[PDB]
């Protein structure tokens, strides 16, 4: 029985390929077709396709075409020496709010001022002078930000293999693979150190990383309980409407209607115990005979250490130091309320000049909202990092970090890849061609 080569056409062999997926949403409105009214899904069966959420070529497709639509809605610096002082007053301590000098011819809260001093003889009077935080940055443009559940769909000729195994870890094989032409609701909300309005899991809290035994790799933690948060600004600002230029607007809002209550947040301490208690129970598995110590973040730029929000159109920077702040020797221990349970707060600062889109560098201006601001979201994910230190005595310290901006989207695109169908394949058999 001599074998012979035979070519077949219609083989189900797959090949991972890249493409330019198109958006889809209900209602930000350019190039996005409406959602599919018939979201078909076919379970393949006994297939084991090795996934890899870290080497995925879809996260780059989402990181791009989102700075692109962001730039389409932003199509100016005027850095002059300011002059201000402390405001006339869980309480606000120092929040400078004043007006500047000459605009063309003859209120910047706290993280957008840089102190200076002239060379005159006014040093005996203590006359301070400020400057904008992005005075020497490339382009400072000026403009509602509401996340819409964008759906990425595959083009003609390509498919999407969505796994369904509830025990994901990031890489390795899957056992329940199904094909879909689109995806679930993806909220493009930007934030650091915490993932808001994400997607909960189906089993216990799972962690995932490219190499858990490495320190530079981001450790994405997906929860299974929508921990709520209540961040609000109890102040009241009024639109100044300063016009500078031939038909140009600017809004350096501010009013004294009791500027003493500092904007903060509220997190359920009872719910926060059950979350971290299950996380340490999972981290102890990969890290045996060790103490999972949580600690304060790093330093440098103020937009790194703090959490980034978006509440109705204003950005909040909150000190996340009261969060995690413990040692956690064994599983589910080391509590600290002594019978309190009094809503652990987070003091927050508010910026106006935003170093928009981490990686390139092109700031923008956020127009303030007239009145009180109140928002509420669900803390569903967590970004972490491990400090590789030689003083490791069974205490591997973890920090919130924040990592790259792409890590906020790898926690939602970890379930699928884009494949191409190669239809021809060869195989040997016993037939022979007549000649």
């Amino acid at each position, epitope marked *: 029985a001599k074998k012979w080569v035979t070519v077949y056409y219609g083989v189900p062999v797959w090949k991972e390929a890249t493409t330019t997926l198109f958006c889809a949403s209900d209602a930000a409105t350019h190039a996005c077709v409406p959602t599919d009214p018939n979201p078909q899904e076919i379970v393949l069966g006994n297939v084991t396709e090795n996934f890899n959420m870290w080497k995925n070529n879809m996260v780059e497709q989402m990181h791009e075409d989102i700075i692109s639509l962001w730039d389409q809605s932003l199509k100016t610096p005027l850095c002059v020496t300011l002059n201000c002082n402390n405001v006339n007053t869980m309480e606000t301590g120092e929040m400078k709010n004043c007006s500047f000098n000459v605009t063309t011819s003859i209120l910047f809260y706290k993280l957008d001022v840089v102190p*200076l001093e002239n060379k005159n003889n006014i040093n005996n009077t203590n006359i301070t002078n400020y400057r904008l935080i992005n005075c020497n940055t490339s382009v400072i443009t000026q403009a509602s930000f509401e996340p819409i559940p964008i759906h990425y769909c595959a083009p003609a000729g390509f498919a999407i293999l969505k796994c369904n195994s509830k025990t994901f870890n990031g890489s390795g094989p899957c056992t329940n693979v199904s094909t879909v032409q689109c995806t679930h609701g993806i909220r493009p909300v930007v934030s650091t150190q915490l993932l808001l309005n994400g997607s909960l899991a189906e089993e216990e809290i799972v962690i995932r990383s490219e190499n858990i035994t490495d320190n530079a790799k981001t450790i994405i933690v997906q929860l299974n309980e929508a921990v709520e948060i209540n961040c609000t600004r109890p102040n009241n600002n009024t639109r100044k409407s300063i016009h500078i230029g031939p038909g140009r607007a600017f809004y350096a809002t501010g009013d004294i209607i009791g500027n003493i209550r500092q904007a903060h947040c509220n997190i359920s301490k009872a719910r926060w115990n059950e979350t971290l208690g299950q996380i340490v129970a999972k981290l102890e598995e990969q890290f045996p005979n060790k103490t999972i110590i949580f600690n304060h973040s790093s330093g440098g730029d103020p937009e790194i250490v703090t959490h980034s929000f978006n509440c109705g159109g204003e950005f909040f920077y909150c000190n996340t130091t009261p969060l995690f702040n413990s040692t956690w020797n064994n599983t589910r221990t080391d509590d600290y309320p002594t019978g309190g349970e009094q809503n652990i707060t987070l003091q927050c600062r508010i910026k106006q000049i935003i170093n928009m889109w981490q990686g390139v560098g092109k700031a923008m201006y956020a127009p303030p909202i007239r009145g009180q601001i109140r928002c509420s979201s669900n803390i569903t994910g967590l970004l972490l990092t491990r400090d590789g230190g030689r003083d490791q005595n069974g205490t591997e310290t973890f920090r919130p970090g924040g990592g790259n901006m792409r890590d906020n989207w790898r926690s939602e695109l970890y379930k699928y890849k884009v494949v191409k169908i190669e239809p021809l394949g060869i195989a040997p058999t016993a037939c022979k061609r007549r000649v």
Partner: antibody
Amino acid sequence: QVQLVQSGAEVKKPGASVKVSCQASGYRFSNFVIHWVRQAPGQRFEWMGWINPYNGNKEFSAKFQDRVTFTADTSANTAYMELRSLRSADTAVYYCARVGPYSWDDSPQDNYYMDVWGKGTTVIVSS
Amino acid sequence: EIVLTQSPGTLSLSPGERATFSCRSSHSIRSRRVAWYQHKPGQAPRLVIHGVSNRASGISDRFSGSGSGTDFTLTITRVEPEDFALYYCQVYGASSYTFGQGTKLERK
């Protein structure tokens, strides 16, 4: 521990492009701002600018406006410094520094005082 | 714009004395935020104080910063031979800041 290791010496002809590199080891390079200063034998130190590897924000002094450019690699934990033009007066020892951590009770620029320096490389224009 | 001045340039000191430093800037620092360095010959520079009076990490208690306005001073109680180096002054961290002249803790 935190340590910055620079590259070796690089003697180049006047009109070339010297590429001085930095290397972060004991921390996360994508979170701190890197400074570059210059030191001439007998003179004083002099700031050359900084680069923010997090958001790509670059700012260089007016004296080195069209002469020195800044580039950084996040995935390699290295910061680079290119020079457009050269001159025999640029024979000096180049450094590399790192800003400090940010506290909750200070201005956004009160923590750029160059905490950790580096083993300074030297360049010679005409030997 | 900003030019720093230091005095004295030399110090005829012995191990166990006290040194006097001064950084009279051309301007007057409003925030009162400066820094001081330690540059040994051959080695890498080292930060002395990360503020007008806030010392850096690992720096001993012998170094102590003080002053305000334009009288940016320093003092070294019970000097040691392991600190004989060049000391520089700072202004601030902003769009423009210069460096000091440089003192020398001479053994003679």
